[PDB]
């Protein structure tokens, strides 16, 4: 079921690693700066995601941080199947970067802006994700 | 009221956990943070505000709220300033499964939000989708 499908990618800025989870059906994003592109940090990020939204499947790039035990254990535990927006996000980060000392803050401002922007009766990604999930429950 | 959250701190193993509760549903977001400072508090609120439509946050109005940083983040995000025992129980039930407290906290949030005739996670999206 497509309300439950997410795509996870990494992106890199200032020598730091940003994980970006996109809810495929809405375009809603969750992203954060993480210390290193490791299985442990990747598993943590997914555990957090899975507690907030009803995550069924997460499509990943299948690289090094996914070959070990830790992401597999977290996805097993949480019941997750492992079966342009990077550029968009970076564009927004660049507009706000001088407003924050730390990149991590700029990233969360950029998530805010991405999720809440109304491009029109046209909804934001934040509104789209809730409407899609609410529809699937009732 | 769909936009109202409550933010409280709780302490375990010498670490600080911030807990945001969506008052109308009981849905929670929580994380271990390095220190109960304005800067870490503001970061947490900025993250929350990007994920949900946050209009009002009720806080304990303590030391981490007197400075410039939380005020600057809430201004920016358009937030007006105006469960711990449950979470800690769940944390204790899963703690031996994780080396690090932070992981146990996120397993506990998962359990809290998904336990079920709706779960808190279902209740929050229904409330917000009704308001839109």
């Amino acid at each position: 079921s497509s309300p439950g499908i997410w795509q996870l990618d990494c992106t890199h800025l200032e020598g730091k690693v940003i994980l970006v989870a996109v809810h495929v059906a809405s375009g809603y994003i969750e992203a954060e700066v993480i210390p290193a592109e490791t299985g442990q940090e990747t598993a943590y990020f997914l555990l957090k995601l899975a507690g907030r939204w009803p995550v069924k499947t997460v499509h990943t790039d299948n690289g090094s941080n996914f070959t070990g035990a830790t992401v597999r254990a977290a996805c097993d535990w949480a019941g997750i199947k492992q079966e342009s927006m990077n550029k968009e996000l970076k564009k927004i980060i660049g507009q706000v970067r001088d407003q924050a000392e730390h990149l991590k803050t700029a990233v969360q401002m950029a998530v805010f802006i991405h999720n809440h922007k109304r491009k029109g009766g046209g909804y934001s990604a934040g509104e789209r994700i809730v409407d899609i999930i609410a529809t699937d429950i009732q | 009221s769909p936009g109202i959250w409550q933010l409280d701190c709780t302490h375990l193993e010498g670490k600080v956990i911030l807990v945001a509760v969506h008052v109308a549903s009981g849905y929670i977001e929580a994380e271990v943070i390095p220190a109960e400072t304005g800067q870490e508090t503001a970061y947490f609120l900025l993250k929350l505000a990007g994920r949900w439509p946050v209009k009002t946050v009720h806080t304990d109005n303590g030391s981490n709220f007197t400075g410039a940083t939380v005020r600057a983040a809430c201004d920016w995000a358009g937030i007006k300033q105006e469960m711990n025992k449950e979470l800690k129980k769940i944390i204790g039930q899963v703690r031996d499964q994780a080396e690090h407290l932070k992981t146990a906290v996120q397993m506990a949030v998962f359990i809290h939000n998904h336990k079920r005739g709706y779960s808190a996670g279902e209740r929050i999206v229904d409330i917000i989708a009704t308001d839109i």
């Binding site: 407003q99 000392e101 730390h102 | 503001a42 410039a68 940083t69 920016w76």
Partner: peptide
């Protein structure tokens, strides 16, 4: 000076 700080 910036959002997350002075």
């Amino acid at each position: 000076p910036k959002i997350d700080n002075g």
